[PDB]
Amino acid sequence: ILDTENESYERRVTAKNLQDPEDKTPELTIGEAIEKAFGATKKDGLLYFNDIPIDESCVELIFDDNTANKIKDSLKTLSDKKIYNVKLERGMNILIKTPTYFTNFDDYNNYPSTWSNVNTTNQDGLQGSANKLNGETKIKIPMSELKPYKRYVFSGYSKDPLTSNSIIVKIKAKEEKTDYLVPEQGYTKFSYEFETTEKDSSNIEITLIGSGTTYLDNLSITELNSTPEILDEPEVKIPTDQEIMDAHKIYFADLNFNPSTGNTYINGMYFAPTQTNKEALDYIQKYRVEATLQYSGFKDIGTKDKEMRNYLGDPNQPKTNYVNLRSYFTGGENIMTYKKLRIYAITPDDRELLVLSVD
């Protein structure tokens, strides 16, 4: 498969299966297969699609387990340790992802803005020139040349012929990731990852600071996948514990009178609606009450749901919370006024709050 980040190409090519003598099919190394599978050209021994460099250095490569392990040991045996020189067997599942942004300091400059330190005067890099510049090279991308919610990889090659010193790599991205690189005599790939967000967030900034003379080439950036994220919402408005007790600050007790020694034994309750509490009287779902009955004392009487009757019985007045003390779990007895009583508002989350107390 080819990535070629405007349209993909997939091909199929016959393998040899060395374990059969009667298969007189030709034998092909990987690199040989690629040039025929995509009509690629060899400008310098490197493979070029139309002008896009293609080999182990300039691109990213992706393998299946079998297809990778069958190279893992087929390389330590070969004379040349280049992958494109490994042959082809059946069932290899390969993938060639091309960089979206690439420079070898010889032919290719994808990057919109250029690096702060160039030094293209060289003959190293495994290819043409190489960035020497013992100093540091920054790079800034406006994030407008990037797919927003994706993660890319940053690949390239580094060597230090005196194998003494080393480099840092900062990536100002989703996160500010930190990174230290120890190059070697020969070149080595690094391929550090990072994530982008927000569709013109802060310009994404990659800085490379290294003390002592350093050598670079084939700096590739290339997409991998999408990353989910979350912005900013209107969330659960758990109102308070105070506005509850500010919603019930206005109440009225509906009373059923007794003709003999009239002491207005309670029939129920309300909680007055005004302009403000019409949100705060709504979160209270249950009502715990404990009262003082007639023939016995101060019993605990139920937590049944509210009733939502018309306030004061005035049909024009709206409907608001009614706590029918009559329907609670009394033994069947009335509830006097001017003696002890307490009503608890219990939020749905089992968090009781006192809201008034008869004293």
Next chain:
Amino acid sequence: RNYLGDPNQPKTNYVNLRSYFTGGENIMTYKKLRIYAITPDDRELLVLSVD
């Protein structure tokens, strides 16, 4: 509501002061009162004032 309660008269705007968010109390006449017409676009306009 029906204007003046006369069923032959048409239906026109009624502002039921009783159904408003009073604490449960009446509204006297010959003492201060003001009614605001609020257009749907949240643009209030005074339309009469008891004085």
